[PDB]
Structures are given as C-alpha cells and as structure tokens.
Amino acid sequence: SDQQLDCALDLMRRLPPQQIEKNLSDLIDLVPSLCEDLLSSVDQPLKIARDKVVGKDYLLCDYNRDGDSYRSPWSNKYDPPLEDGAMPSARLRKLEVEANNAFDQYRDLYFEGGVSSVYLWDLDHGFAGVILIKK
C-alpha cells in the first residue's frame, strides 16, 4: 500500500487549502491504519490551546505533543493532566522561556497581534526547537 500512500500525498498536494483539516480527517477515514503516517508530512493549520494558570495562549503540534498532552511553555505543564511527560532540560527551560519572550517580540513587531510558541528539545551536540506562529 505504498503506492496508495504516494497517491494520497499527491491528493493532499492538490487538495483545496480551505478544508485541510476536514479532508485530512476524511483521507484518514479511508485507511486509518495509515493515519499517523500522514500526520507527519501533511501540512494543516494549528490548534490554539489555553494555559489556564497563566492566561496566555500556546499552539499545538507534535513537538509539544508530549504523550497525548501539550507542554504549555508559559507554564511548563501538560494538558491533558499527564504528570509523566518529558520535561525539557531546566537549562533549556530557561532558554525556552526567553525564546518565547523573544518571539513574542518578533510576533508583535511583524504581526501586530497573533499567537506564538517556541518549544525546544535536545541533540547530542546541540538542541532543536520549533517555532509556531498563527495570525
């Protein structure tokens, strides 16, 4: 079913970018055994979460998808309440909070509003992060 996957990606390639989420769910509803195989290279919009304790916003992707929860960078907590997630390095947590700060400045300068988020993770000789911006 590998050719089926190639044609599926081409179908998303030619799919109308107005109903990306719904049609992606439909395509997954065809062959659900190939579901979380497509949710790695099929670009779709973001999901806005809500940090309850801080009163901010934070976007959702796979990098913050810790287990099945989301690490709110404004609070470093997981939502759904998973107290078993993969916390980042405390070093990287400080680097991440300043990252979120700098990109809030970035977002405010170009977008004049909108929501942003910057998550982080390791590397043997470095680190790696993701930057979400949704205006």
């Binding site: 993969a86 916390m87 390095s89 405390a90 070093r91 390791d122 043997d124």
Partner: protein
C-alpha cells in the same frame, strides 16, 4: 588490621576474620548497588540532561580486597 595481630593467629580465627571482611565488602557492594539504583531513579525523576557521569568508581577498599 593493626590491632588484630593477624600474622600470628591460626587459620580458624583468621578464617572467621576473613569471612567477616568479605561480609563488610558484600554489604558495601549490594547496598551500594541499591544506592546506585536510587540515584538512577533520582536522575530519571529530575529529567535534566545526558551527561557523561562516571560510575567507574575505584574506591579505597578494593586496594586491600585484591
């Protein structure tokens, strides 16, 4: 070992002292492995990094044990 006068006793008393020495050494080894596992789960519950932590410990008692 200084207050033992170990170089003159018989093998009965020296054997008992020998076994007691290995008793202490085994308390060190198994309880130290329990402390090892203790610190292992401590580093797991803290979730900080992947440092090159040296556990190749050559303490001050193996020097006499050999």
């Amino acid at each position: 070992l200084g207050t033992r006068k170990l170089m003159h006793v018989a093998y009965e008393e020296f054997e008992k002292v020998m076994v007691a020495c290995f008793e202490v050494f085994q308390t060190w080894d198994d309880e130290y492995e329990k402390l090892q596992v203790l610190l292992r789960d401590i580093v797991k519950r803290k979730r900080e990094e992947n440092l090159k932590m040296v556990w190749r410990i050559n303490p001050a008692h193996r020097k006499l044990q050999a």
